[PDB]
From Swiss-Prot:
Underlying gene: der
Name used for this protein in its record: GTPase Der
UniProt organism field: Thermotoga maritima (strain ATCC 43589 / DSM 3109 / JCM 10099 / NBRC 100826 / MSB8)
Subunit structure: Associates with the 50S ribosomal subunit.
Domain KH-like: 326-407
PROSITE patterns attached to this UniProt entry: G_ENGA
Binding site for GTP 1: 7-14, 40-44, 103-106
GO terms of biological process kind: ribosome biogenesis
Cross-referenced Pfam families: KH_dom-like, MMR_HSR1
Top-rank taxon: Bacteria
Domain comment, as recorded: Each G (guanine nucleotide-binding) domain has activity on its own; domain 1 is twice as active as domain 2. The G domains do not interact, instead each contacts the C-terminal KH-like domain which lies between them.
UniProt keyword annotations, A-Z: GTP-binding, Nucleotide-binding, Repeat, Ribosome biogenesis
Job description of the protein: GTPase that plays an essential role in the late steps of ribosome biogenesis. Has GTPase activity but no ATPase activity. GTP, GDP, and dGTP but not GMP, ATP, CTP, and UTP compete for GTP binding.
Length: 407
């Protein structure tokens, strides 16, 4: 389920957001084991009456309709303003279920006397008085949100069930420990080579995986490496911690990123590294400087020989795949974009109007801009980073960008 916080500037949306999720514009709220996604839409829907284009109005309406519920926040001390009225009109038009929340209403007696009456004119019934800053009545509001979501038949308890097998490729230079690592996985009770009558179907934790080109688990073509990367969803690149990161490792990483595969980076033979426990920062910096191409990848320190961190490697593959298949609300993408652009000046005459996610495997976003030629590498790095920083980290997954010229 997804809940959107809507409201004009300075009504306390950020404070309310931070209080509910316990800065990003999207996060999760937990309630007695039940959860839902929360999005502070910031100013994405401000001045809706100023949208001239019918297409743009329809796109904006679809953004709000992504929500199962909207928390329409107004200022309980100041009262109704023209901006609250325009937002109210847009929300009513959208027909999306909405809860009117009057923040800054700690002084209940004054609120009901001076402001509550006028709030009825917004068309959403009686407002729920709360105080995000003083943590007042937030529990009653939450209970109300949960009830409404459940009444709509939404499941706030079960985590989405995966249907496809997760294809994994284990790659790396000869002798780094690929074969040993693959067998280390198979030796654990949580894994099992499918008993059901060049790949291997493997079950781990009750989930289905396909480890590609397992036959291997002088060199000239490396056709298997390229083929394996293409076939996989998640690619585990294994490095020999005693050797560091070679140029060939960098080439494989570049290939992984260009093909848009999820990934996990493993420093194996960690047991052979001297004074190893005092060198995590050193190796992490090496990973960041040599493999920045795929720095979104979890970095696991393993010993395939001693059986160190095989579990962390498996969990990392699961996390990478989860990010690889994650979809985020367009309201969140645009809320983040507008929040950052507020204090960011784009070069040349570049303008980035809005964006939306258009695919997964890998997560791919389309941004509408005034000029495609004005979008250079720094702006692409900038867009991927704001998504990771404010929307969802997408740990383990690359983020692809597409652009469309518009006026
Ligand atoms: N000390 C140590 N030896 C390892 C480790 N992983 C693999 N090895 C050894 O190093 C060699 C390379 O292993 P291999 O698994 O055949 O990797 P491959 O060519 O990547 O598939 C073998 O002699 C292994 O026993 C590790 O984590 N620690």
């Amino acid at each position: 389920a997804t809940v959107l916080i809507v409201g004009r500037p300075n009504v306390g949306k950020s404070t309310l957001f931070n209080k509910l999720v316990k800065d990003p514009v999207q996060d999760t709220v937990e309630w007695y084991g039940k959860t839902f996604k929360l999005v502070d839409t910031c100013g994405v829907f401000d001045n809706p009456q100023d949208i001239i284009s019918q297409k743009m109005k329809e796109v904006t309406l679809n953004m709000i309709r992504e929500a199962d519920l909207v928390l329409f926040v107004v200022d309980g001390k100041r009262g109704i303003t023209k901006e609250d009225e325009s937002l109210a009109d847009f929300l009513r038009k959208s027909t999306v279920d909405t809860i009117l929340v009057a923040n800054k209403a700690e002084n209940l007696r004054e609120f009901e006397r001076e402001v509550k009456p006028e709030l009825y004119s917004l068309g959403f019934g009686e407002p729920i008085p709360v105080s995000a800053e003083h943590n007042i009545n937030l529990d009653t509001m939450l209970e109300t949100i949960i009830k409404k979501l459940e009444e709509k038949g939404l499941d706030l308890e079960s985590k989405p069930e995966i249907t496809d097998a997760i294809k994994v490729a284990i790659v790396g230079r000869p002798n780094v420990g690929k074969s040993t690592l693959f067998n280390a996985i198979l030796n654990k009770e949580r894994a099992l080579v499918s008993p059901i009558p060049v790949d291997d179907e493997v079950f781990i934790d009750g989930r289905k995986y396909v480890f590609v080109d397992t036959a291997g688990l002088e060199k000239y073509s490396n056709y298997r490496v390229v083929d394996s990367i293409e076939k996989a969803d998640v690619v585990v690149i294994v490095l020999d911690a005693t050797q560091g990161i070679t140029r060939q490792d960098q080439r494989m990483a570049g290939l992984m990123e260009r093909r848009g595969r999820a990934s996990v980076v493993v420093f194996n033979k960690w047991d052979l590294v001297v004074h190893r426990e005092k060198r995590y920062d050193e190796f992490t910096k090496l990973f960041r400087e040599k493999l920045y191409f795929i720095d979104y990848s979890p970095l696991i320190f393993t010993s395939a020989d001693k059986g160190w961190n095989i579990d962390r490697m498996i969990d990392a593959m699961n996390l990478a795949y989860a990010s690889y298949t994650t979809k985020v609300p367009s309201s969140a993408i645009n809320s983040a974009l507008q929040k950052v652009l507020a204090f960011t000046n784009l070069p040349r005459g570049l303008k980035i109007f809005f964006g939306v996610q258009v695919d997964i495997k890998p997560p791919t976003f389309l941004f509408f801009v005034n000029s495609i030629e004005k979008v250079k590498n720094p702006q692409k790095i900038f867009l991927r980073k704001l998504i990771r920083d404010y929307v969802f980290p997408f740990e383990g997954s690359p983020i692809f960008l597409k652009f469309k010229r518009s006026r």
